[PDB]
Design an enzyme around this catalytic site. Structure first.
Site, PDB file in Angstrom:
ATOM      1  N   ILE B  22      -4.752  -3.709  -1.055  1.00  0.00           N
ATOM      2  CA  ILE B  22      -5.360  -2.970   0.074  1.00  0.00           C
ATOM      3  C   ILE B  22      -5.458  -1.485  -0.190  1.00  0.00           C
ATOM      4  CG2 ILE B  22      -5.087  -2.187   2.457  1.00  0.00           C
ATOM      5  CD1 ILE B  22      -3.765  -4.899   3.002  1.00  0.00           C
ATOM      6  N   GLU B  24      -3.077   2.269  -1.960  1.00  0.00           N
ATOM      7  CA  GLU B  24      -1.864   2.955  -2.369  1.00  0.00           C
ATOM      8  C   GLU B  24      -1.804   4.363  -1.766  1.00  0.00           C
ATOM      9  OE1 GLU B  24      -1.892   3.140  -6.843  1.00  0.00           O
ATOM     10  OE2 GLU B  24      -3.881   2.340  -6.504  1.00  0.00           O
ATOM     11  N   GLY B  25      -0.695   5.052  -2.019  1.00  0.00           N
ATOM     12  CA  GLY B  25      -0.505   6.434  -1.591  1.00  0.00           C
ATOM     13  C   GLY B  25       0.690   7.065  -2.294  1.00  0.00           C
ATOM     14  N   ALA B  26       1.121   8.201  -1.747  1.00  0.00           N
ATOM     15  CA  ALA B  26       2.452   8.754  -2.020  1.00  0.00           C
ATOM     16  C   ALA B  26       3.497   7.763  -1.474  1.00  0.00           C
ATOM     17  CB  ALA B  26       2.609  10.134  -1.372  1.00  0.00           C
ATOM     18  N   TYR B  27       3.182   7.166  -0.314  1.00  0.00           N
ATOM     19  CA  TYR B  27       3.985   6.095   0.297  1.00  0.00           C
ATOM     20  C   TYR B  27       4.179   4.799  -0.532  1.00  0.00           C
ATOM     21  CZ  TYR B  27      -0.556   4.268   2.085  1.00  0.00           C
ATOM     22  OH  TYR B  27      -1.832   3.773   2.180  1.00  0.00           O
ATOM     23  N   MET B  29       2.409   1.284  -2.948  1.00  0.00           N
ATOM     24  CA  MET B  29       1.291   0.307  -2.948  1.00  0.00           C
ATOM     25  C   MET B  29       1.384  -0.742  -1.833  1.00  0.00           C
ATOM     26  SD  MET B  29      -0.178  -2.059  -6.065  1.00  0.00           S
ATOM     27  CE  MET B  29      -0.767  -0.631  -6.963  1.00  0.00           C
ATOM     28  N   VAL B  30       0.282  -0.965  -1.128  1.00  0.00           N
ATOM     29  CA  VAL B  30       0.128  -2.004  -0.107  1.00  0.00           C
ATOM     30  C   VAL B  30      -0.783  -3.174  -0.558  1.00  0.00           C
ATOM     31  CG1 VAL B  30      -0.507  -2.430   2.304  1.00  0.00           C
ATOM     32  CG2 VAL B  30       0.409  -0.252   1.652  1.00  0.00           C
ATOM     33  N   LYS B  45       4.190  -3.506   1.818  1.00  0.00           N
ATOM     34  CA  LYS B  45       4.220  -2.226   1.104  1.00  0.00           C
ATOM     35  C   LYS B  45       5.325  -2.243   0.078  1.00  0.00           C
ATOM     36  CE  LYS B  45       5.826   1.570   3.174  1.00  0.00           C
ATOM     37  NZ  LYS B  45       5.933   2.608   4.225  1.00  0.00           N
ATOM     38  N   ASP B 140       2.598  12.433  12.178  1.00  0.00           N
ATOM     39  CA  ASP B 140       1.495  12.127  11.257  1.00  0.00           C
ATOM     40  C   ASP B 140       0.478  11.211  11.856  1.00  0.00           C
ATOM     41  OD1 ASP B 140      -0.011  12.629   8.808  1.00  0.00           O
ATOM     42  OD2 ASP B 140       1.012  11.030   7.736  1.00  0.00           O
TER      43      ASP B 140
HETATM   44  C1  LIG Z   1     -17.110  -2.854   7.377  1.00  0.00           C
HETATM   45  O1  LIG Z   1     -18.109  -2.361   6.886  1.00  0.00           O
HETATM   46  C2  LIG Z   1     -16.162  -3.509   6.387  1.00  0.00           C
HETATM   47  C3  LIG Z   1     -16.790  -4.800   5.862  1.00  0.00           C
HETATM   48  O2  LIG Z   1     -15.859  -5.885   5.958  1.00  0.00           O
HETATM   49  C4  LIG Z   1     -16.033  -6.734   7.103  1.00  0.00           C
HETATM   50  C5  LIG Z   1     -14.882  -7.735   7.246  1.00  0.00           C
HETATM   51  O3  LIG Z   1     -13.752  -7.296   6.486  1.00  0.00           O
HETATM   52  C6  LIG Z   1     -12.557  -8.067   6.693  1.00  0.00           C
HETATM   53  C7  LIG Z   1     -11.843  -8.351   5.367  1.00  0.00           C
HETATM   54  O4  LIG Z   1     -10.739  -7.459   5.188  1.00  0.00           O
HETATM   55  C8  LIG Z   1     -11.140  -6.147   4.795  1.00  0.00           C
HETATM   56  C9  LIG Z   1      -9.933  -5.405   4.246  1.00  0.00           C
HETATM   57  O5  LIG Z   1      -9.322  -4.692   5.324  1.00  0.00           O
HETATM   58  C10 LIG Z   1      -8.111  -4.038   4.956  1.00  0.00           C
HETATM   59  C11 LIG Z   1      -7.454  -3.500   6.232  1.00  0.00           C
HETATM   60  N1  LIG Z   1      -6.156  -4.079   6.395  1.00  0.00           N
HETATM   61  C12 LIG Z   1      -5.202  -3.540   7.123  1.00  0.00           C
HETATM   62  O6  LIG Z   1      -5.233  -2.536   7.804  1.00  0.00           O
HETATM   63  C13 LIG Z   1      -4.011  -4.376   7.068  1.00  0.00           C
HETATM   64  N2  LIG Z   1      -2.790  -3.714   7.411  1.00  0.00           N
HETATM   65  N3  LIG Z   1      -2.026  -4.396   8.349  1.00  0.00           N
HETATM   66  C14 LIG Z   1      -0.947  -3.653   8.431  1.00  0.00           C
HETATM   67  N4  LIG Z   1       0.051  -3.976   9.224  1.00  0.00           N
HETATM   68  C15 LIG Z   1      -0.954  -2.497   7.555  1.00  0.00           C
HETATM   69  C16 LIG Z   1      -0.120  -1.446   7.289  1.00  0.00           C
HETATM   70  C17 LIG Z   1      -0.548  -0.515   6.395  1.00  0.00           C
HETATM   71  C18 LIG Z   1       0.273   0.651   6.039  1.00  0.00           C
HETATM   72  C19 LIG Z   1       1.698   0.733   5.631  1.00  0.00           C
HETATM   73  C20 LIG Z   1       2.591  -0.418   5.518  1.00  0.00           C
HETATM   74  C21 LIG Z   1       2.175  -1.670   5.023  1.00  0.00           C
HETATM   75  C22 LIG Z   1       3.102  -2.735   4.956  1.00  0.00           C
HETATM   76  C23 LIG Z   1       4.393  -2.558   5.390  1.00  0.00           C
HETATM   77  C24 LIG Z   1       4.775  -1.316   5.912  1.00  0.00           C
HETATM   78  C25 LIG Z   1       3.899  -0.247   5.982  1.00  0.00           C
HETATM   79  N5  LIG Z   1       2.024   2.024   5.383  1.00  0.00           N
HETATM   80  N6  LIG Z   1       0.863   2.740   5.620  1.00  0.00           N
HETATM   81  C26 LIG Z   1       0.792   4.080   5.511  1.00  0.00           C
HETATM   82  C27 LIG Z   1      -0.435   4.717   5.808  1.00  0.00           C
HETATM   83  C28 LIG Z   1      -1.557   3.973   6.221  1.00  0.00           C
HETATM   84  C29 LIG Z   1      -1.426   2.577   6.346  1.00  0.00           C
HETATM   85  C30 LIG Z   1      -0.192   2.033   6.023  1.00  0.00           C
HETATM   86  N7  LIG Z   1      -1.704  -0.660   5.752  1.00  0.00           N
HETATM   87  N8  LIG Z   1      -2.615  -1.705   5.988  1.00  0.00           N
HETATM   88  C31 LIG Z   1      -2.243  -2.626   6.893  1.00  0.00           C
END
Ligand SMILES: *C(=O)CCOCCOCCOCCOCCNC(=O)Cn1nc(N)c2cc(-c3c(-c4ccccc4)nn4ccccc34)nnc21
EC number: 2.7.11.24
Lengths: 17, 350
Positions: B22, B24-27, B29-30, B45, B140
């Site tokens: 999905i 990555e960041g400083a935080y 990889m997701v 993550k 943030d």
């Molecule tokens: C439109 O034009 C797009 C075309 O596509 C149409 C249909 O698309 C659907 C298919 O999927 C597309 C891919 O989407 C990716 C988005 N997914 C998410 O947001 C999923 N997501 N769920 C959670 N929860 C989540 C958290 C974070 C995140 C974390 C973190 C992750 C896991 C555990 C702890 C923390 N830390 N973060 C820091 C900063 C930002 C986000 C984040 N990320 N994505 C996540």
């Protein structure tokens, strides 16, 4: 992303009944 | 051996499989994954913080806070995977429910209706009320930190900059500088860089509201003092009273050196926005933090009157106190504390 539904179809909205 | 994503080991099986990148960041990889035990999709993550004291400090804070929070508009932690012995723990994997999208992505593709703007703002503030009731500052908030499903349910995530600030104790001089993402950074982060308050989150929310109204950031500074220039070009130069509330002599003198700028009316920037929305926007994007609207009063504003319900807006049962803030510790001790805090999820599957 696309395909944003009506607010009516939200868990939070739907509980409030 | 363990599953791999873009060259990186992601040692989360056998419970969690079918990994997809999905971001990555400083935080760290997701990935998305499937939880074979509960039969649900998850986000995972991978964090590798243990060589850096500040990364350890932030991992411990995020984990302590989110494990204690329970609220519909804040992303929960389902599970945490790490090695069974401290010496082997190099990596930590945090697992959450997978959300479909975020507000950043949505605003790249979609003008939102007033109804959706209004309902999203309600939920941001509903969650923020719980967060501020616990004595936590998020620090943030921004569109990419607001996760959404297409059902319109919104959850605040990304508590890596979050911290406790017990209001029995004056934190002036002791808070970390250069928090928030630049465009969403309150003025007092520049001008009172070690003595700001939770009011910085209200500012961020105001910036997010402005972005939802127009699909573009309101204060897109290209660098640190240019941020303050963007702010001042919309708000105008601060009043004499507002200047006098700035205790740091250096910062007030910097302000006094700047050329006068006039307030740009909210309705010239947002000609088609709902007036109640603009009124609330004004109150959030108020220069003086002592005059900025607080979360409960924001929720009680006329713009949100169809959702405001203090009987269905939980606050924290047990607010965090000053005890939970003395985390300025050597990174080895922080590692011990991260191990202890994650032990409740041990053992993990093979
Ligand atoms: C439109 O034009 C797009 C075309 O596509 C149409 C249909 O698309 C659907 C298919 O999927 C597309 C891919 O989407 C990716 C988005 N997914 C998410 O947001 C999923 N997501 N769920 C959670 N929860 C989540 C958290 C974070 C995140 C974390 C973190 C992750 C896991 C555990 C702890 C923390 N830390 N973060 C820091 C900063 C930002 C986000 C984040 N990320 N994505 C996540």
């Amino acid at each position: 992303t696309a395909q944003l539904k009506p607010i009516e179809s939200s868990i939070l909205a739907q509980r409030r009944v | 051996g363990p599953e791999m994503v873009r060259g990186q080991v992601f040692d989360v099986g056998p419970r969690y499989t079918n990994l997809s990148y999905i971001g990555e960041g400083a935080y760290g990889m997701v990935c998305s994954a499937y939880d074979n035990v509960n039969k649900v999709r998850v986000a995972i993550k991978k964090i590798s913080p243990f060589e850096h004291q500040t990364y350890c400090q932030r991992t411990l804070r995020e984990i302590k806070i989110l494990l204690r929070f329970r609220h519909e508009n804040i992303i929960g932690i389902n599970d945490i995977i790490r090695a069974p012995t401290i010496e082997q723990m190099k990596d930590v994997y945090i697992v959450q429910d997978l959300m479909e999208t975020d507000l950043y992505k949505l605003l790249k593709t979609q003008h939102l209706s007033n109804d959706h703007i209004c309902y999203f703002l309600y939920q941001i503030l509903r969650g923020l009320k719980y967060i501020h009731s616990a004595n936590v500052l998020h620090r943030d908030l921004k569109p990419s930190n607001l996760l959404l499903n297409t059902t319109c349910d919104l959850k605040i995530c990304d508590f890596g900059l979050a911290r406790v600030a017990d209001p029995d104790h004056d934190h002036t001089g002791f808070l970390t500088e250069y928090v928030a993402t630049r465009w969403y950074r309150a003025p007092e982060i520049m001008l009172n860089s070690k003595g700001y308050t939770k009011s910085i989150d209200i500012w961020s929310v105001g910036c997010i509201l402005a972005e939802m109204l127009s699909n573009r950031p309101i204060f897109p500074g290209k660098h640190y003092l240019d941020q303050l220039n963007h702010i001042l070009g919309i708000l105008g130069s601060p009043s004499q009273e507002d200047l006098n509330c700035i205790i740091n002599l250096k910062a007030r003198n910097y302000l006094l050196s700047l050329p006068h700028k006039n307030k740009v009316p909210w309705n010239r920037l947002f000609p088609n926005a709902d007036s109640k929305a603009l009124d609330l926007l004004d109150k959030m994007l108020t220069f003086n933090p002592h005059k900025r609207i607080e979360v409960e009063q924001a929720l009680a504003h006329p713009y949100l009157e169809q959702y405001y319900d203090p009987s269905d807006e939980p606050i924290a049962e047990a607010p965090f106190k000053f005890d939970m803030e003395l985390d300025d510790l050597p990174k080895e001790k922080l590692k011990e504390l991260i191990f202890e805090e994650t032990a409740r999820f041990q053992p993990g599957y093979r």
